[PDB]
Amino acid sequence: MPNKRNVELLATLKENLERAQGSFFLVNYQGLPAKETHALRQALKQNGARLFVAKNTLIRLALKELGLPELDGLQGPSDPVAAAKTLVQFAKSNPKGIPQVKSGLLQGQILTAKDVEALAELPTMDELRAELVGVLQAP
Amino acid sequence: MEYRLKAYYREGEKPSALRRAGKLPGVMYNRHLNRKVYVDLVEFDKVFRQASIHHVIVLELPDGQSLPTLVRQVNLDKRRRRPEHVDFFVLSDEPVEMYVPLRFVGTPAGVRAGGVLQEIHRDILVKVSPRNIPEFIEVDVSGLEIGDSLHASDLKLPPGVELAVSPEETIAAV
RNA sequence: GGGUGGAGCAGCCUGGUAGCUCGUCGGGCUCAUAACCCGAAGGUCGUCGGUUCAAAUCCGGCCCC
RNA sequence: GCUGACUGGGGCCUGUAGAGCACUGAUAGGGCUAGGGGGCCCACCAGCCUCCAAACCCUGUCAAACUCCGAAGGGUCCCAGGUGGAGCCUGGGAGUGAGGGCGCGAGCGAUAACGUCCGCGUCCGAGCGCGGGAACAACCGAGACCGCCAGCUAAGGCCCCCAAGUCUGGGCUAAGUGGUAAAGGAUGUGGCGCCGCGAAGACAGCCAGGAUGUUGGCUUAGAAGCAGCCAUCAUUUAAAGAGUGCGUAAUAGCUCACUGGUCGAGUGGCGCCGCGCCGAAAAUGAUCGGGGCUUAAGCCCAGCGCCGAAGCUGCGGGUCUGG
RNA sequence: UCGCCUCCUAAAAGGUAACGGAGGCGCCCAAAGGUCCCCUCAGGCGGGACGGAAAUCCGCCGGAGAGCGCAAGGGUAGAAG
RNA sequence: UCGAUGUCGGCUCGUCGCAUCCUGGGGCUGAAGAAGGUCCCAAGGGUUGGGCUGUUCGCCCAUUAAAGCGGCACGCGAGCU
Ligand SMILES: [K+]
Ligand SMILES: [K+]
Ligand SMILES: [K+]
Ligand SMILES: [K+]
Ligand SMILES: [K+]
Ligand SMILES: [K+]
Ligand SMILES: [K+]
Ligand SMILES: [K+]
Ligand SMILES: [K+]
Ligand SMILES: [K+]
Ligand SMILES: [K+]
Ligand SMILES: [K+]
Ligand SMILES: [K+]
Ligand SMILES: [K+]
Ligand SMILES: [K+]
Ligand SMILES: [K+]
Ligand SMILES: [Mg+2]
Ligand SMILES: [Mg+2]
Ligand SMILES: [Mg+2]
Ligand SMILES: [Mg+2]
Ligand SMILES: [Mg+2]
Ligand SMILES: [Mg+2]
Ligand SMILES: [Mg+2]
Ligand SMILES: [Mg+2]
Ligand SMILES: [Mg+2]
Ligand SMILES: [Mg+2]
Ligand SMILES: [Mg+2]
Ligand SMILES: [Mg+2]
Ligand SMILES: [Mg+2]
Ligand SMILES: [Mg+2]
Ligand SMILES: [Mg+2]
Ligand SMILES: [Mg+2]
Ligand SMILES: [Mg+2]
Ligand SMILES: [Mg+2]
Ligand SMILES: [Mg+2]
Ligand SMILES: [Mg+2]
Ligand SMILES: [Mg+2]
Ligand SMILES: [Mg+2]
Ligand SMILES: [Mg+2]
Ligand SMILES: [Mg+2]
Ligand SMILES: [Mg+2]
Ligand SMILES: [Mg+2]
Ligand SMILES: [Mg+2]
Ligand SMILES: [Mg+2]
Ligand SMILES: [Mg+2]
Ligand SMILES: [Mg+2]
Ligand SMILES: [Mg+2]
Ligand SMILES: [Mg+2]
Ligand SMILES: [Mg+2]
Ligand SMILES: [Mg+2]
Ligand SMILES: [Mg+2]
Ligand SMILES: [Mg+2]
Ligand SMILES: [Mg+2]
Ligand SMILES: [Mg+2]
Ligand SMILES: [Mg+2]
Ligand SMILES: [Mg+2]
Ligand SMILES: [Mg+2]
Ligand SMILES: [Mg+2]
Ligand SMILES: [Mg+2]
Ligand SMILES: [Mg+2]
Ligand SMILES: [Mg+2]
Ligand SMILES: [Mg+2]
């Protein structure tokens, strides 16, 4: 029972569990289209942008284990910068070229339930929130 | 590493029956002792395949003993390659003769270009106390070039050792 | 038991290199020839596996005579 | 007239079987090295380096005419047991001097012959008288003085022919194997075993996807994986061989290496044993003695019974020989 | 092919067959015979003028493989030499 | 089996085997078709006339769907030659 050379060399490599704001992490269908989601195979020395391995490995016996415990999302089992470069790397989320790049289970640290209406399909939160200077604050 | 075999006792007991029950007869003897013994064949195999006389066996005798031994003679039935007796020689004060397997890091670490190397390759008989019992002895430095004959008077010789054979056999060849 | 440079044949035996003649080619001697004295090219030695660092040169099959 | 075959105990004699390599030779591989074998700065003539290559060094064998060893058995002598259609001695009468099969050990043969020739046993011969073997001189049982409508058994048998079990248990085979002939062959079958992967989840399948400059350098009207030689570069990786398949006016279109996914339990390989299967074609009409039989009326391991001969018992008689 | 001798076959006494295997004898020696006293091989390694693998010599080593008139076997240096 | 079992070839009459020559089935093909190649099933029937020679067998002529190989005391002389 040599038990999954992945579960040592690709058990997330015991890597990037804590790195990259160890909460909030990933979702949605390890991948349908090899026709419209490019930007692999070309970053001059390595990709480091798509996925590594093994959805099923960690979704069972990778416990809370150094993230930030929050709870609200969509369903069960099926990038470094947090909540900002969401759809600025891949997966434009319906159509994206191949329809229904659907969903998963997410939890960051504050009050996120649906998250494709508020933080996924390219919103404005760090530049459009400049409306707290004379709106609802100063007469 | 050492191994263990459970080594029951026996006096009469026509040996053809011991085979008919799956148990391998043998003998246990040394300078001060000789008794009739027999082991189970099945566990003997799983052990002796790696016991491979170079290594020591404890045999953990019934009668409360635990008697360490080196295997020295195995008469396998001429017909079917299957053993039909074991000679268990009891290690005692010091020293004995024995064979020790060799490891190879010699020249040119396997052969230069696959030409004339064709050396003498097996374990070797040594004389040593029953304590400095080496697991293997690496055939050492690889400066024995094309056509060199640096014979058995040769490599490392860990602490307990003796030229128990021809001081020069042919350890390295053409 | 034979199958070798174009023809004829030696070389196998005794396995570390295939050669004479004639033909051909060119030269020597002729006044110009014939012959003659000299070399030139060319085979891998039916073919198949093995041997050996080597075998047309050892071994055995098939082949054609 | 206790001397005999056979037997017990001893004492020496032997050179087979088996094994062995020390002699005699034969022998595979390596080492180390005369002499060749070929090659070099060549004749001072010796300078090395890798098939032959004697003796020697291990490492492995072979032998009727080799033996460092060597049983069992066999022969002989002594002391004993053995009173036997036994032994010995003298003498009278013969017949026989074509043997044969079987077992074991050989030789010739072809590790052929119901072959041939010795050896030791046995049997037919002469027991072609009796039971079994279907039938059948010599295989198994057993040495037939005669009589009996009595008994027990041997080989072999007990479903019917056909006497006695369709007897008892526990396994196996599905071929009519039994009622067969081999090298070999193979998801037949039933057991023992070993390794291999698997509940962060494997083997089936059903979901996805194998995209690069992509001309892969090189080939090349073009081979842009799939006509071929491939620097088989590496840009890598949920994954993707510049390509295992079909595709092919180079492309369009297509599939499999490989991960991931759903379902969620065993899975795939190796060896062994018992029995069976293919391999399996011959000459009038078929069949294992026949009919028939398949948890047997077939094979393997137990066991209980019974049947069964001219054998042994019983009863009666006959002679012969002892006492 | 035919008598004699040696080995094998010949199955550990003797004996044992075949157009089975493989070899010899039909002589020789007045010294090769009798006896007494002596002496020990063959090879192998070094050394040694003409001498080489060897002629003869010295050294050490060498339990019998030499020799025993001729085949083979048995025997044999504590002699048969 | 020698107080006999007539030895080859032909003729006549056959019959049986199948390891099939043709005919009817069939698989694979480097099977386009046609026509073959090869292996499988199949013994029901069929399987020619001539020249040569004692011949069997062969080799030829002309044909054919094809000119099958064996067994039967190399079938068959109380049937013939
Ligand atoms: K007596
Ligand atoms: K005796
Ligand atoms: K020897
Ligand atoms: K008489
Ligand atoms: K007899
Ligand atoms: K008799
Ligand atoms: K049957
Ligand atoms: K004298
Ligand atoms: K008669
Ligand atoms: K006759
Ligand atoms: K056909
Ligand atoms: K027919
Ligand atoms: K003829
Ligand atoms: K016929
Ligand atoms: K007649
Ligand atoms: K006739
Ligand atoms: Mg006696
Ligand atoms: Mg023997
Ligand atoms: Mg012998
Ligand atoms: Mg002894
Ligand atoms: Mg007496
Ligand atoms: Mg008498
Ligand atoms: Mg006579
Ligand atoms: Mg006679
Ligand atoms: Mg006779
Ligand atoms: Mg006789
Ligand atoms: Mg007799
Ligand atoms: Mg027997
Ligand atoms: Mg006879
Ligand atoms: Mg016989
Ligand atoms: Mg015989
Ligand atoms: Mg006769
Ligand atoms: Mg008679
Ligand atoms: Mg009769
Ligand atoms: Mg009978
Ligand atoms: Mg009878
Ligand atoms: Mg009889
Ligand atoms: Mg009587
Ligand atoms: Mg009875
Ligand atoms: Mg009985
Ligand atoms: Mg009855
Ligand atoms: Mg019953
Ligand atoms: Mg049958
Ligand atoms: Mg699967
Ligand atoms: Mg039963
Ligand atoms: Mg009476
Ligand atoms: Mg009488
Ligand atoms: Mg004798
Ligand atoms: Mg005898
Ligand atoms: Mg000498
Ligand atoms: Mg001698
Ligand atoms: Mg008559
Ligand atoms: Mg008559
Ligand atoms: Mg047929
Ligand atoms: Mg047809
Ligand atoms: Mg056609
Ligand atoms: Mg005419
Ligand atoms: Mg005529
Ligand atoms: Mg005709
Ligand atoms: Mg005939
Ligand atoms: Mg005949
Ligand atoms: Mg006739």
XYZ file of N, CA and C (backbone and C1' of nucleotides) in Angstrom, chain A residues 26-38 40 49-56 77-78 90-93 95-104, chain D residues 207-210 237-240 258-262:
205
model
N -10.383 27.668 -3.199
C -10.940 27.619 -4.545
C -12.124 26.659 -4.690
N -12.658 26.636 -5.917
C -14.045 26.286 -6.205
C -14.170 25.794 -7.652
N -15.345 25.265 -8.025
C -15.791 25.216 -9.421
C -15.033 24.325 -10.402
N -15.222 23.002 -10.317
C -15.162 22.212 -11.546
C -13.798 22.225 -12.229
N -12.849 21.437 -11.714
C -11.421 21.503 -12.028
C -11.102 21.638 -13.518
N -12.090 21.451 -14.388
C -12.066 22.113 -15.684
C -12.660 21.366 -16.858
N -13.610 22.014 -17.543
C -14.187 21.538 -18.796
C -13.370 21.911 -20.036
N -13.192 23.221 -20.354
C -12.712 23.579 -21.695
C -11.203 23.708 -21.818
N -10.601 22.928 -22.707
C -9.274 23.255 -23.232
C -9.381 23.948 -24.589
N -10.260 24.950 -24.676
C -10.479 25.690 -25.917
C -10.567 27.201 -25.737
N -10.902 27.714 -24.550
C -11.061 29.152 -24.358
C -10.315 29.724 -23.157
N -9.882 28.906 -22.195
C -9.142 29.393 -21.026
C -7.653 29.138 -21.255
N -7.002 30.103 -21.898
C -5.575 30.060 -22.191
C -4.811 30.760 -21.063
N -1.944 29.510 -19.884
C -0.972 28.532 -19.425
C 0.151 28.415 -20.453
N -0.392 28.773 -12.418
C -1.626 29.545 -12.468
C -2.910 28.742 -12.640
N -2.869 27.409 -12.709
C -4.080 26.668 -13.065
C -4.602 25.772 -11.948
N -3.828 24.779 -11.514
C -4.211 23.785 -10.514
C -3.034 22.831 -10.386
N -3.032 22.029 -9.323
C -2.009 21.005 -9.184
C -2.576 19.590 -9.251
N -3.476 19.194 -8.354
C -3.936 17.805 -8.310
C -5.123 17.680 -7.365
N -5.874 16.582 -7.511
C -6.482 15.836 -6.401
C -7.471 16.674 -5.582
N -8.614 16.950 -6.211
C -9.767 17.456 -5.468
C -10.120 16.558 -4.281
N -10.258 15.246 -4.518
C -10.822 14.364 -3.495
C -9.896 14.193 -2.298
N -18.767 18.785 -2.362
C -17.574 18.418 -3.141
C -17.842 18.071 -4.602
N -17.125 18.730 -5.512
C -17.171 18.407 -6.938
C -16.026 19.087 -7.683
N -8.682 33.678 -15.060
C -9.360 32.749 -15.959
C -10.845 32.720 -15.603
N -11.611 31.937 -16.371
C -12.973 31.519 -16.016
C -13.921 32.712 -15.834
N -14.224 33.363 -16.962
C -15.115 34.524 -17.007
C -16.552 34.215 -16.571
N -16.840 32.964 -16.199
C -18.082 32.617 -15.502
C -19.323 32.911 -16.356
N -20.475 33.458 -20.108
C -20.164 32.237 -20.864
C -18.755 31.658 -20.749
N -17.724 32.506 -20.686
C -16.332 32.054 -20.690
C -16.002 31.294 -21.979
N -16.958 31.202 -22.902
C -16.753 30.443 -24.122
C -17.446 29.094 -24.102
N -17.396 28.417 -22.960
C -18.123 27.176 -22.726
C -19.076 27.435 -21.563
N -20.387 27.313 -21.757
C -21.337 27.882 -20.794
C -21.315 27.171 -19.447
N -21.771 27.906 -18.428
C -21.932 27.414 -17.057
C -20.598 26.957 -16.454
N -19.720 27.941 -16.250
C -18.595 27.800 -15.327
C -19.152 28.105 -13.941
N -19.647 27.073 -13.252
C -20.791 27.281 -12.363
C -20.430 27.839 -10.986
N -19.844 27.009 -10.115
C -19.808 27.346 -8.690
C -19.138 26.285 -7.820
N -18.996 26.579 -6.523
C -18.444 25.643 -5.555
C -18.805 25.972 -4.119
P -20.679 8.632 -21.495
O -20.873 9.749 -20.379
C -20.032 10.885 -20.344
C -20.142 11.624 -19.037
C -19.351 12.919 -18.968
O -20.002 14.006 -19.594
C -18.844 11.633 -17.081
P -19.549 14.455 -21.069
O -18.477 15.605 -20.807
C -17.140 15.471 -21.266
C -16.154 15.970 -20.240
C -14.828 16.495 -20.767
O -14.913 17.825 -21.254
C -14.449 15.083 -18.902
P -14.950 18.131 -22.833
O -13.510 17.708 -23.361
C -12.512 18.687 -23.609
C -11.358 18.523 -22.659
C -10.083 17.939 -23.251
O -9.267 18.878 -23.926
C -10.647 16.706 -21.358
P -8.452 18.417 -25.233
O -7.140 17.722 -24.655
C -5.866 18.333 -24.802
C -4.786 17.314 -25.068
C -4.832 16.630 -26.428
O -4.203 17.401 -27.439
C -4.513 15.013 -24.714
P 2.398 24.049 -17.403
O 2.779 23.408 -15.990
C 1.834 22.657 -15.238
C 1.479 21.359 -15.921
C 0.253 20.637 -15.398
O -0.970 21.216 -15.808
C 1.989 19.085 -15.651
P -1.828 22.039 -14.729
O -3.240 21.303 -14.703
C -3.326 19.920 -14.395
C -4.369 19.650 -13.340
C -4.567 18.188 -12.967
O -3.610 17.703 -12.044
C -6.658 19.138 -13.425
P -2.259 17.012 -12.574
O -2.620 16.547 -14.051
C -1.653 16.642 -15.083
C -2.058 15.867 -16.307
C -1.437 16.329 -17.612
O -0.053 15.996 -17.758
C -3.748 16.042 -17.927
P 0.479 14.678 -18.517
O 0.219 14.983 -20.061
C 0.016 13.935 -20.999
C -0.489 14.474 -22.315
C 0.493 15.341 -23.093
O 1.386 14.564 -23.876
C -1.659 16.369 -23.037
P -2.339 4.678 -18.994
O -2.186 6.180 -18.482
C -0.914 6.702 -18.121
C -1.018 8.115 -17.602
C -2.104 8.367 -16.567
O -1.737 7.962 -15.259
C -2.171 10.069 -18.202
P -2.777 8.125 -14.043
O -2.483 9.584 -13.472
C -3.189 10.080 -12.345
C -3.582 11.523 -12.533
C -4.957 11.903 -12.009
O -4.958 12.169 -10.619
C -4.693 12.739 -14.203
P -6.058 11.486 -9.669
O -7.360 12.371 -9.899
C -7.340 13.765 -9.644
C -8.407 14.483 -10.429
C -9.820 13.951 -10.257
O -10.442 14.425 -9.076
C -9.372 14.253 -12.553
P -11.314 13.436 -8.158
O -12.725 13.378 -8.891
C -13.375 14.571 -9.300
C -14.463 14.275 -10.295
C -15.437 13.186 -9.881
O -16.448 13.661 -9.012
C -14.711 12.787 -12.091
P -16.705 12.942 -7.599
O -17.931 11.969 -7.886
C -19.147 12.486 -8.405
C -19.881 11.465 -9.238
C -20.181 10.141 -8.559
O -21.308 10.210 -7.702
C -19.356 9.752 -10.747
